[PDB]
Design a protein around this ligand. Sequence first.
Ligand SMILES: [Zn+2]
Ligand SMILES: [Zn+2]
Lengths: 358, 361
Amino acid sequence: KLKKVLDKLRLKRKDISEAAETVNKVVERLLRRMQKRESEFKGVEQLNTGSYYEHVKISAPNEFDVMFKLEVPRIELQEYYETGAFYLVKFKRIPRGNPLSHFLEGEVLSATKMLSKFRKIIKEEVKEIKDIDVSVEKEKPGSPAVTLLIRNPEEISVDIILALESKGSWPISTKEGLPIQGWLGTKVRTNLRREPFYLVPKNAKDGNSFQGETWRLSFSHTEKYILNNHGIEKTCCESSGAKCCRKECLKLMKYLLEQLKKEFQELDAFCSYHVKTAIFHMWTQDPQDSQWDPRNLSSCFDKLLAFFLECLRTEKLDHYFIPKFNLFSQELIDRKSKEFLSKKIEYERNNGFPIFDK
Amino acid sequence: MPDKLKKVLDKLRLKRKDISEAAETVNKVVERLLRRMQKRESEFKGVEQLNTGSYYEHVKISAPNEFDVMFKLEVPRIELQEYYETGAFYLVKFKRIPRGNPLSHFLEGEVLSATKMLSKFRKIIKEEVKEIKDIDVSVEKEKPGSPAVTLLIRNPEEISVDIILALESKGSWPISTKEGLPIQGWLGTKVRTNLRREPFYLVPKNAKDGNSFQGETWRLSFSHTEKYILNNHGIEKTCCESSGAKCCRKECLKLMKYLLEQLKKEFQELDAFCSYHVKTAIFHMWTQDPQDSQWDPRNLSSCFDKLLAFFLECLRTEKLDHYFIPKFNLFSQELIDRKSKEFLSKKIEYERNNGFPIFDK
DNA sequence: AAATTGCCGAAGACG
DNA sequence: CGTCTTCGGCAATT
DNA sequence: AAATTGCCGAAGACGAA
DNA sequence: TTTCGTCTTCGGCAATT
Ligand SMILES: [Zn+2]
Ligand SMILES: [Zn+2]
């Protein structure tokens, strides 16, 4: 039953091959143009992130996320006051010249000014691409990305994400996040927290104070690693180990939310990251690979469903990396909307998931 | 018995006071030697340090009185030539220009002389040790088969420090290792692949039995990989971590090392055997029995017994494959006479059959 | 660049 | 069995 | 130095017993 | 049936030229 849904969601190699060929061509051209053109972004490097690169993209390979990350030495973060997720970026005392000086709006780094120049560079190179049908999508509120729309002829979206990279210890709001000690272990946690951290523009258009200078933490790199290294046993899903159903449960939950969001505008405020965050908590709660045996896919999916519903009921879904940041706060999603989603999930759960049959 | 093995482990356990005092002195001497070699105008200026062996693996028993340290020198653009299909032994040649590389005076042909390099390495170390006035330390006379310059420190307690000369190469490992490191069902394929992307090391064979190419033969060293495995030894990521379960893998290795050490002290016919034979055997046993549950501390006696049984079968069949170089038989007739292996079998059998009287000190 | 700095896991020491 | 402590390893940073 | 090279893990494609 | 084994391609990483 769920097995057939998973077969339907599984990507086809031909599609993957055709999509990746084009995406890689465009992205490499844009990355290299950025690295060579005289600008503040000369030093960008690429990190592929998101569902496709985590092997959990469903149905079609038509969405690609790519970070163009820029190391920014000697920064000092100022927490956007209550929120452990949002920050203003200031600079420690400079030796002989900050090359991001043109982007300073006060003492603070302007995400809006940096993004405008970044966007300008991408657009000017995209105009020169004559061998692929690609355009830059008009800027969207709340997005840290320059989005490309490719017609291959099939529609493919590529989010080029501007990120600042900082190699120091992670912000203190993350100190009690990443609770993987009983699952992936303390060596893994310590190693993950020695990798850099990333800030991307919040880019909200709400007109709130500091809107052009507010940055958001991103842990897409850590999430990617975890998805590829997700078992308590080192051999989980490897060629000399046992397959688990962890990723399959995530695919199913994303599909459920995707189908619901398709026909209910009441669910605009919900997104796949809510589901991803929920399953990370579930992987922490149930760390043993044997709790994710393929033979128990049905019960595993139901357990995840129950957990998500309880998050909705209690209006609490802690960010996995920033515990004090509630993705289900009233301020973020109205109490009315969570109740709506609960009802819908409860329906599908109690009626054999009809929405899975399109 | 369970009681005796527990008491033996208690006795073998190092004391923190002893550790602190030994490390303090060792660290001072090694740092001084490393900096001297890096600061001076010598062929060895780029050396970097890697601590290895039992102490740094947390399996040194009884006293913190033996320290191994590699001074590793990167050698870009070399070509290896396997010496007599041994798989463990190599001649080293240089690819090309600029021919203003160091080590040019170490060539005995197009072939890098281990003996010439080791002599200069030893000469530099000896000169600096002569200037050490705050610690009682001397350089031990060269020993056959050693890749190390050995220091003897009196702290006042005797401490030996092996300073090992190693060449570092960052390319893929020699082909003789291709089917070695059989950890795929235990530590896994990502771990194996990542470990085989670390550099490989060559150290002087430094034999003195007069064979051809004696001064130019190098042998592969996997001490860095072994150290990693010892600190990362569980099928579960949480093995022996603060939020995981303690296993008895290292404790079994301690017991077997102690057994061999005690037998070696009273029987000189066991001269051919060494702790590496024990280490190699247990790496195989960890591959054979990969589950952390197969190394539960409550089953210490049975775990030690299975390792003994496995070692005895290696002895009987005269075959103990190098864990990293499968075709290299540590228990071959050429390396260890048949009579010596039969003698050790009888002794281990006797100890096992009698509940380890030799452990009664 | 050398070498100080910060962190935290491993395992001995201590209620 | 828990919690404290010190040594070691790694790399960001000055 | 920027970018080719080489490896091999993850997982899709597919025939077999 | 479900699922090995085999073959395959795409991507991550870094040593190298
Ligand atoms: Zn798995
Ligand atoms: Zn363990």
